[PDB]
Symmetry: C4
């Protein structure tokens, strides 16, 4: 198996034409900005997630409701979510943001973020932005189809393809 561009599509007989239009997308949400990740407290209560495995409510203990504490409690809850704190200089005074993302891509792995219930915080936490889970969009011999993940065993029979990047308008030739 050879890909015309392993940095768009790689894998492990015929002439196969594949275009990666969009990668599959994880559902995700990003907080408003905070001036620090280790002092300003967001309060006590819970954050609600609606997931393919049902409603999940992650309990935020005032003990440690800094952005860092909340990230660690979301990760320790093991509810199909991965949290991290990122720095976004769009607001230089409030650069720190909580990013929470599903672990799976595809329309069927949707996560929503419908409620943050928190009392006594130093500052309001909210998800300023969210993104829905999405399928990959790929073209096979010019036909756009949707895939749940960034891999396929069906497009090139006998090969497992992994999409490495989205490159709309950059059709790649593969051979086997």
């Amino acid at each position: 198996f050879l890909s015309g561009d392993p940095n768009i599509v790689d894998g492990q007989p015929g002439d196969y034409a594949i275009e990666v239009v969009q990668l599959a997308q994880k559902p995700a949400a990003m907080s408003n900005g905070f001036p620090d990740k280790d002092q300003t407290q967001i309060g006590v209560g819970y954050i609600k997630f609606e997931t393919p495995e049902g409603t999940k409510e992650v309990y935020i203990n005032g003990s440690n409701s800094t952005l860092d504490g909340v990230m660690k409690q979301i990760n320790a809850a093991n509810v199909g979510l991965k949290a991290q704190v990122v720095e976004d200089r769009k607001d230089q005074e409030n650069p720190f943001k909580l990013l929470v993302s599903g672990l799976s891509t595809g329309n069927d792995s949707q996560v929503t973020f419908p409620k943050i219930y928190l009392l006594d915080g130093d500052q309001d936490m909210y998800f300023e932005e969210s993104r829905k889970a999405q399928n990959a969009k790929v073209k096979v011999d010019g036909f756009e189809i949707e895939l749940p993940d960034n891999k396929s065993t069906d497009l090139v029979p006998g090969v497992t393809l992994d999409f490495k990047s989205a490159a709309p308008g950059r059709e790649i030739r593969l051979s086997v």
Copy 2:
């Protein structure tokens, strides 16, 4: 021989400027979606193809007219067509589609799909989408010309070029 980008154009004395605008395209058609590829039967009769080698009619035996059976019978017919079943999550309830493609690219290798004649199926099969065969479009020193295949022995004299991907607006420099 060196290509400025082997993942757009590679091959096996001068300064050669080549842009791959569009890869050469196989003629192809893709079915409507089915809920499965191994149970729902499309019926008995035939599927008609108009090819550069003349009219071809592939006989679909009710014995095995699942999408999988039809794919196997199209391939076994040896009429210049390659069939496979793909999964397209655009319709989650009916994800399975038959993709049928010519083996050759270029305007002169046209295939059309003018008739599906099938009685007693569980569900209607039809080609929801088709694509015409097309030439590659490449620019040599800025002039767009058309090629039948994704290779050339004429653009860089003494070298066989293979186009690995389309990259419109990305002129590549080659040397020999």
Copy 3:
């Protein structure tokens, strides 16, 4: 020296930001299509070129005024021009075209094609398309400047850069 993308810019201390907007372009002209390159004769006389080295008139001998003969006579004239015959399937009946290009890029290496004087041909030859010589356009720390060739010793002091492809909007980081 390291380039962030050797397939856009490569070469042989600091942080250097380079974008290749357009490669430098050779002046060139391409004929109308012919049904063959080895039988149909274009006649006797000459083809005129205006070059940076002055007016050049290449004499076409009726002995061999096929597209192939003309290509060989232009090359043998040694007037700063390189000719080849390409196949362009835009007109399937008349696919063969003469491509004539200058050997140098840049605005100062302009070539024009102002006259074809040919009597007794089987078919009219003319330059259906021509292209002017052009400078490369590159951005250095965001400023677009023009270069005569697809190389530079000035952009990154102490290094000779060779532009491998044009990639407008794809700023590359280089280090030394």
Copy 4:
């Protein structure tokens, strides 16, 4: 750690989706064109820079106020600026330009060029163009955030990422 495209993002466990929308930009200014870099004198006085470290005034000695002399005096001043002379064929008669750039990227590393005070020059020097310092723009799981530099230790926890090129619309998959 593996990047789907090391020529966009490289570095040194999870599924990480990163798009480099724009590289971080150095503040910079480029002069008008001069016919030479080693004879035409721009005069005596100073060039003013406003920098994050305060107002800096670089003294231009008539002894050597060629574009080359000025470049060398700006570099020898050690005021957070790097100067070089580039050749820009946009004006073939006046191709030589002084490019002066900050050493740091990001909104907080702004440099402006508010005054050139020079008497007795052969020709006027001025900054025909300038560019403000800017943050990198990157998307993490589809959310655009701003970074001061072309690196990050926060996007992929436990890895130092270096952005090698901007590739808007080309989301890259990374793994750890």
